[PDB]
Amino acid sequence: VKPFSFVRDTDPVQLVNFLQSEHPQTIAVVLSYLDPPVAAQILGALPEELQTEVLKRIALLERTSVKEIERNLEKKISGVGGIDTAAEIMNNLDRTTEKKIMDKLVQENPELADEIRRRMFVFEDILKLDDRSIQLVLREVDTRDLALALKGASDELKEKIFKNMSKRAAALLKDELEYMGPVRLKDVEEAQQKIINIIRRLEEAGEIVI
């Protein structure tokens, strides 16, 4: 079973009560093991002074120093946490708290802040992109992944994507949808994740405009 799994079984406040007086690092460890919405809920309820530091430690969980990297590597060779975890927690925080943590990271860890922000991109964020960028992305997506990803998108996002496809691609997509049928929710999920990865890569290449 997974560590800290008894957390959803534990009380609400007594939970924040104990974590409050623990070392930030110890806090980072416990939260990085929980479902993000749960972690975001706890994080936002922690004393303001711990929020940023704890979020940063979650982001750099086993990357804190060259020594830590060297040690962790050796373990895996012989016998959790990270940027994604942090970004997922930030997406589930209330806007206000999220903004405060991001503003501080921008000031003290500008790079890490940038890694987290870019990792925070969700499928609906595609609505933030301009039409040209969207077309750029579409050329990198196969018909089936697109169809799957769309079964989990808002009608508005559906539209903005459609009006940006080539006539031939749109026809192929429509065909897929017609003979696709019901699908496992997790397929819709990885399809969207796949498109998101394409976006994350196209911006690392500095060719994606918001």
Side-chain angles (χ1 to χ4, degrees):
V1 275
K2 198 172 192 189
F4 299 98
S5 138
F6 64 74
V7 141
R8 272 212 172 191
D9 275 308
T10 160
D11 352 30
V13 300
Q14 3 292 332
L15 186 40
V16 170
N17 181 196
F18 305 108
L19 293 178
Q20 286 187 314
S21 46
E22 291 289 357
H23 183 77
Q25 179 54 45
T26 304
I27 296 179
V29 166
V30 177
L31 300 204
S32 80
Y33 272 104
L34 306 171
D35 190 33
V38 176
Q41 180 178 49
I42 295 172
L43 182 53
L46 286 179
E48 126 88 294
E49 36 265 295
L50 305 181
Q51 310 191 315
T52 300
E53 238 47 42
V54 162
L55 190 285
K56 188 179 71 180
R57 282 171 182 287
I58 290 177
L60 306 165
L61 197 66
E62 289 149 357
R63 298 176 34 191
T64 71
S65 65
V66 177
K67 219 66 200 171
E68 179 124 276
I69 295 169
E70 174 169 44
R71 253 179 283 147
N72 283 294
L73 182 59
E74 291 177 295
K75 297 199 65 183
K76 300 166 189 174
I77 269 62
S78 76
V80 71
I83 304 303
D84 262 285
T85 303
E88 277 157 39
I89 293 180
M90 291 285 273
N91 278 323
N92 291 291
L93 273 179
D94 57 290
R95 223 136 308 166
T96 301
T97 300
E98 187 284 319
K99 247 67 169 179
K100 295 181 173 186
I101 293 179
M102 186 53 84
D103 283 349
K104 189 192 184 188
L105 293 183
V106 167
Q107 276 297 175
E108 276 303 301
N109 295 276
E111 235 302 297
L112 175 59
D114 198 87
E115 276 165 52
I116 298 178
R117 192 186 20 273
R118 285 186 294 92
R119 278 300 188 63
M120 281 174 74
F121 197 88
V122 294
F123 198 65
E124 287 299 318
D125 284 319
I126 289 171
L127 290 173
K128 250 74 199 40
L129 312 187
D130 80 287
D131 282 35
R132 306 242 74 190
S133 286
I134 293 182
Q135 286 154 30
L136 201 89
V137 176
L138 294 185
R139 287 175 302 195
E140 313 273 341
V141 186
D142 64 278
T143 301
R144 189 157 199 283
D145 280 318
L146 197 43
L148 289 168
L150 288 176
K151 286 189 168 300
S154 59
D155 291 357
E156 165 191 24
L157 175 53
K158 293 195 180 66
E159 268 292 72
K160 192 167 188 185
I161 285 174
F162 221 75
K163 67 184 176 74
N164 276 290
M165 301 181 230
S166 66
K167 281 287 179 182
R168 79 192 311 282
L172 269 345
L173 176 63
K174 294 181 177 178
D175 260 88
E176 173 65 343
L177 297 168
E178 290 173 352
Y179 304 100
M180 177 168 244
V183 301
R184 301 268 211 185
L185 170 61
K186 74 295 300 118
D187 298 310
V188 168
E189 274 292 351
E190 15 180 298
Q192 293 188 343
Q193 179 81 319
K194 241 152 172 173
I195 297 186
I196 288 174
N197 293 330
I198 290 178
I199 291 168
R200 201 166 69 222
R201 172 176 60 69
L202 281 182
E203 62 181 309
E204 285 269 354
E207 49 177 302
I208 278 187
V209 182
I210 286 65

